[PDB]
Design a protein around this ligand. Structure first.
Ligand SMILES: NC(=O)C1=CN([C@@H]2O[C@H](COP(=O)(O)OP(=O)(O)OC[C@H]3O[C@@H](n4cnc5c(N)ncnc54)[C@H](OP(=O)(O)O)[C@@H]3O)[C@@H](O)[C@H]2O)C=CC1
Ligand SMILES: NC(=O)C1=CN([C@@H]2O[C@H](COP(=O)(O)OP(=O)(O)OC[C@H]3O[C@@H](n4cnc5c(N)ncnc54)[C@H](OP(=O)(O)O)[C@@H]3O)[C@@H](O)[C@H]2O)C=CC1
Ligand SMILES: NC(=O)C1=CN([C@@H]2O[C@H](COP(=O)(O)OP(=O)(O)OC[C@H]3O[C@@H](n4cnc5c(N)ncnc54)[C@H](OP(=O)(O)O)[C@@H]3O)[C@@H](O)[C@H]2O)C=CC1
Ligand SMILES: NC(=O)C1=CN([C@@H]2O[C@H](COP(=O)(O)OP(=O)(O)OC[C@H]3O[C@@H](n4cnc5c(N)ncnc54)[C@H](OP(=O)(O)O)[C@@H]3O)[C@@H](O)[C@H]2O)C=CC1
Lengths: 262, 262, 261, 262
C-alpha cells in the first residue's frame, strides 16, 4: 500500500503540463486518477497508460470545464467508472498577455470562466459526496499571480487572486470536517503556457534568441534563476492530499523559487 | 481652495451607502462628482442637491454597471457634462450569503460580473484619457473579504480578492505615470448590504432581537466592536486621490477596526 | 488644521523621513518634539524651520536604544508641552551585509533601535493615552517589513517585527480611541539610502551616481522614482486624523508599487 | 532507503513539544538527528531511544540557544559526532503573556533573543558548510503569530514576524544554490507551551474548568476547533526537507486549522 492508495482523484486539464505532473505524482502515491482535457485526442491512450504505469486505475474523460454540464458529466463519469471523487484538483487554466487598455473583453471573460468559476462549479458538485463520506481534498492550482500582480496579466492575476479567496472560504466552511481545501501557487514552470510567452519575448526583444529570452524572462521574476518543475508541483499536491495535511486548511503552498519572498 | 478642486470624479453605485459617503467626501474635498445607480429614481434631484451642498458640480447618471455599453455611456456623459474622468471610484457591489454547495450559479456570476468585471470595464474605458492627460486615480472599493475569507461568502470573497489582484496589475502598468490604482478594504459598515445580513442573523439565532444580532455580528469579526462609517471610507478615498498619494500604487488601504490585524 | 493642539513626538527627526513627518504634523497643527542622539549646533535652526507653521516646537536629545533616555524624552515632552498624544517611532539604522558575515553587534543594534525602542516608547506612552481616551502610535516600518531583500537580514527582521508589534498594540487598544498603525515606505532619498547608492556606484558603475541611482531604484521600485519625505509625512497626518479613527493594526504602504509585484 | 536518508539534522529545543515531533518525523524519514535543550536531563536517554526507534543515528547535546558560544558548540559537536549539519531546524522558543503596558523588559528581550536572534546565530554558523557542499535546509519554526497579531503577545508576535522576515532574506541570498530556507507557521498545538496558557486561563476565568478553557482558547482563533499535532508539524518539516521542495524558497507553510484563512 501507498499513502493515497484507494483514493479516487480527478485532475482537470491533465494530459500535459502541470496537470499531468500532478496526475503522475498522485498515481505514484497510490491514487486512482481521471485525466481530462477539452476534446478527445489521439494521445489519450498513451497518456492514460503512462499514468497507469504505477499500478492504479486511470481513466480519461474529455470535458470543457467552462461548461457546467460537462463538469457535471466528468464527475458522474468518475463516480460510475471508479467511485466517489475524493481528491479534486482544479488545474485547467489559460493565459492571455495584454495591457489592460486593449485586453479583449472575451479573453477576460474566458480567463475568469476557466481559471476561477470552473473551480467553483467542480467544487460545488463534489462537496456533497465528500461531506457524506467524511473526507475530501480540494486542491486549487493558483499561481504566484494570485498573490502579487504582474504587468499585462490583469485577467489572470484577478482570476488567480479570486481562486485563492475562494479556497479560503471553502476551507472555512469545511474546517470542522475531514475535508480540506488549499491552493498551490507555482512560479514559472516550463510548460507550453510559458513557452509561448517566452517565444513572444524572443521575437519582440531578442531577435528570436530563445536562450537569451528564457534567461531574461526567468530572471525578471524568479530569484532561483531556474524553473519550478511539474514534478515539484505534483509533490506539493501529494503533500496536501496526505494525512500530514489533515489540518492544513485554506492556505497557499507557494513553490516559486523565491518570487513572493521578495 | 481645496485639494481636489476641479477634479472630475465618477463614483459607481453612489446614491446610498458607502458610495454616497465617498461622493460626499470627494465633493467636500473639492471634486466635481457624478453619481450613479442602475435606474433613475424620484430621489435623484434630492440626492444631487445633498452632495451639491459642498459647492461643486454634481450630476447623476443611471447606468447598470454589469452592461459594458452602459458603463461607456456613463463615462461619455461625464466627459460631455464636466470633462475627462480624472478620478474613477469602482464602488457598486452586491452580496449573496450562501454555503458553497447551494450557492446559485447565476448569483455567483452576477457577483463576479459586478464586483470584479465591471471594474475592469470602467478602468479600461478611462485609462486612455488619463494617460493622455498625465494624471489619474482609479480607486477600487474592495473589502476585508478581498484579503481573508469568511464562511458563506464564496463568490464575494472571490470577486473582492480578484479586484485586489486587478488593482495591483493596473498600478504596475501605470507605475511610471501620474496614474495610480489602489484599493480600499473596509470592514463592516452599517449600510443596507450589512443590515440585511444582521436581520437574517436576528431571525435565525436571536428571535428577531436586532441589538443582540448586531453585537454578535460585529464582534465575530471586528475587534473595535464598532462599525466603520461611510465617511471614513470616503476619507480614505480622499487620501488616495490627494498629491500625498502620488507614489501609493497597487496597495490596499484597510479601514476595518482591526479585522485583518488578527 | 486637523491636528490642532495635539502634542506629537517624532523620534530621529532632525533629518530624513523623520523631519518630513515632523514638518507635516506641524503643518497640520500639531506641537512637535524633535529628537536625535546628541545635541547639535543645528538644533536651533531645525526647530525654527518646523516652528514656521505656528505651533510649539522643541528638540530633545536622547539615544532611543537606552530605555532611560527614551523615558527622559517622554518626561521632557510632558513637562514642556503636555501629554504625548501622537507618538511616531521613526529612528532607525541600516547595515548591508550577507548573512554569513553580518556583524553580531550590528544585528543587535538594528533589533534594538528598529524594533525594541518602539516597544519601549509605546509602553511609556500608552497609560496616558488610555487615561485621556485618545492616542496615535505610528510606526515607521518599511517595505522590508513585508518582503525580504538580499543583504538586509537584520533590518528585514526588525521591520517585520515592528509590523507584528503594531498589530498587537492595535488589538489591545481596539475598543479605545487609541490606534496603532505602521507606514511602510519604499525607497526615499535620504542619507540612509544615499550611502547604499554610493557603495553600489563604487562597486559596479565606476562611481557614477546617476547610473547607480537608477540601477538601485529600478531593482525594486516599479515607479522608477523615489518616494518623498513629504509623502511619508502626509501618510502620518492621515493616520493621525479623525478619518483614521477605525484604521487599526494595518500598514499604509507608500512604495511606488514595490509590494504590488 | 528513505527520502532523507543520510542527511544530518539538528533540531533546537527538541526533547518535548513540537521539536520532538519534528525530530521524530525527520528520523522516520531517514535523517540522523541531534536533539537539544538547555541543560542535561535524566530523561535524555529515553528521549534518544524514542527518536532512535526509526533506525537512524541520534545524539543529544545540551546548549542554551541564547548563548552564541553554546550554539557554536552544538554545531561543532554535530560535526564531530555525525558530520556536516545539512538540515537546521530552529525550533526552540518561549512565550510570555502580558499586555504591552506591563510587559517586562527582560521578558521582551529574552523572547527576541531566543525566538529570533538565536535562529540568526545558528543560520550564520551553518551556512558556510552548506554552501561548500551545495545543499542545505534551514527550517524556521515561526507561528501564525508571525503573520497576524494576538492580544497580550507583543514580544512573541514581533519575534515571530521577524523570524519570517529573516527567512525570506536567507532564502533570497541562497536562491541560486541547493540551500533553501523556509518557515513553518503552526496554529495551536497542545504542547506544554499551550497547556500552561490554558491552565492559567482555566484558573483565572473558567473556575478551573479545563474543558471550557480549552474550548474557548481554541475556538477564539482556530476554525477547525481542533489542535494541530506535533506529528503534523513534523510532516511539514519533512516535506520542506525533501527534494520536492528544492524550489520552495523563502515561504511559509501554515498548518493552522484555518486560522490565517479568516
Ligand atoms: N506554467 C506556469 O508557469 C504556471 C502555471 N500555473 C497554472 O497551472 C495550471 C496548468 O498550467 P500549464 O500546465 O502551465 O498550462 P498548459 O497550457 O501547459 O496546459 C493547460 C491544460 O489545461 C487544459 N485546458 C485548457 N482549457 C481547458 C478547458 N476549457 N477545459 C478543460 N481543460 C482545459 C489543456 O487541455 P487540452 O489542451 O488537452 O484541452 C491542458 O491540459 C493553470 O491553471 C496555470 O494557470 C500556475 C503558475 C505557473
Ligand atoms: N457595507 C460593508 O460592510 C462593506 C461594503 N463594501 C463594499 O462597498 C460597496 C458598497 O457597498 P454598500 O454601500 O455597503 O452596499 P449597498 O447595498 O448599501 O449600496 C449598494 C450600491 O450599489 C448600487 N448598485 C448595485 N448594483 C448596481 C449596478 N448593477 N449598477 C450600478 N449601481 C449598482 C446601488 O444603487 P441602486 O440600488 O441605486 O441601483 C447602491 O448605490 C460594495 O462594493 C461592497 O462590497 C466593502 C466592505 C464592507
Ligand atoms: N530611506 C528609506 O528609503 C526608507 C527609510 N525607512 C525608515 O525611515 C526611518 C528614517 O529613515 P531615514 O530618514 O531614511 O534614515 P536617516 O539615516 O536619514 O535619518 C536617521 C535618523 O535617525 C536618527 N537616529 C539614528 N539613531 C538614533 C538613535 N539611536 N536614537 C535617536 N535617533 C536616532 C538620526 O538622528 P541623529 O543622527 O541626528 O542622532 C536621524 O535623524 C527609519 O526607521 C528607516 O528604517 C523605511 C523605508 C524606506
Ligand atoms: N505550541 C504551539 O501552539 C505553537 C508553538 N510554536 C513554536 O513551536 C516551537 C516549540 O514550541 P512548543 O513545542 O510549543 O514549546 P514547549 O515549551 O512545549 O517546548 C519548548 C522547547 O524549547 C526548549 N528550549 C527553551 N528555551 C531554550 C533555550 N534557551 N535553549 C534551548 N532549548 C530551549 C525546551 O527545552 P528544555 O526546556 O528541555 O530546555 C523545550 O524542548 C516554538 O518556537 C514555539 O514558538 C508555533 C506555533 C504554535
Amino acid at each position: 500500500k501507498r499513502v493515497l492508495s484507494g483514493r479516487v482523484a480527478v485532475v482537470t486539464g491533465s494530459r500535459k503540463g502541470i496537470g499531468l505532473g500532478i496526475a503522475m505524482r498522485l498515481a505514484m502515491a497510490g491514487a486512482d486518477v481521471v485525466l481530462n482535457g477539452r476534446r478527445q485526442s489521439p494521445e489519450d491512450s498513451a497518456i492514460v497508460e503512462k499514468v497507469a504505469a504505477y499500478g492504479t486505475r486511470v481513466r480519461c474523460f474529455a470535458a470543457n470545464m467552462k461548461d457546467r454540464a460537462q463538469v457535471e458529466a466528468l464527475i458522474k463519469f468518475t463516480e460510475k467508472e471508479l467511485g466517489a471523487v475524493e481528491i479534486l484538483v482544479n488545474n485547467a487554466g489559460i493565459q492571455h498577455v495584454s495591457p489592460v487598455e486593449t485586453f479583449p473583453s472575451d479573453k477576460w471573460d474566458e480567463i475568469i470562466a476557466l481559471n476561477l468559476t470552473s473551480a467553483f462549479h467542480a467544487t460545488q458538485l463534489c462537496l456533497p459526496s465528500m461531506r457524506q463520506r467524511g473526507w475530501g481534498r480540494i486542491i486549487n492550482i493558483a499561481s504566484v499571480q494570485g498573490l502579487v500582480g504582474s504587468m499585462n496579466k490583469s485577467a489572470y492575476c484577478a482570476a488567480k487572486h479570486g481562486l485563492i479567496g475562494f479556497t479560503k472560504v471553502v476551507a472555512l466552511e469545511t474546517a470542522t470536517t475531514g475535508i480540506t481545501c488549499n491552493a498551490i501557487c507555482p512560479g514559472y514552470v516550463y510548460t507550453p503556457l510559458v513557452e509561448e510567452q517566452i517565444k513572444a519575448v524572443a521575437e519582440a526583444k531578442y531577435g528570436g534568441d530563445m536562450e537569451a529570452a528564457t534567461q531574461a524572462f526567468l530572471c525578471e521574476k524568479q530569484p532561483a534563476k531556474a524553473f519550478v518543475t511539474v514534478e515539484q508541483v505534483g509533490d506539493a499536491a501529494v503533500f496536501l492530499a496526505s494525512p500530514g495535511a489533515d489540518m492544513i486548511r485554506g492556505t497557499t503552498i507557494t513553490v516559486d523559487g523565491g518570487w513572493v519572498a521578495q
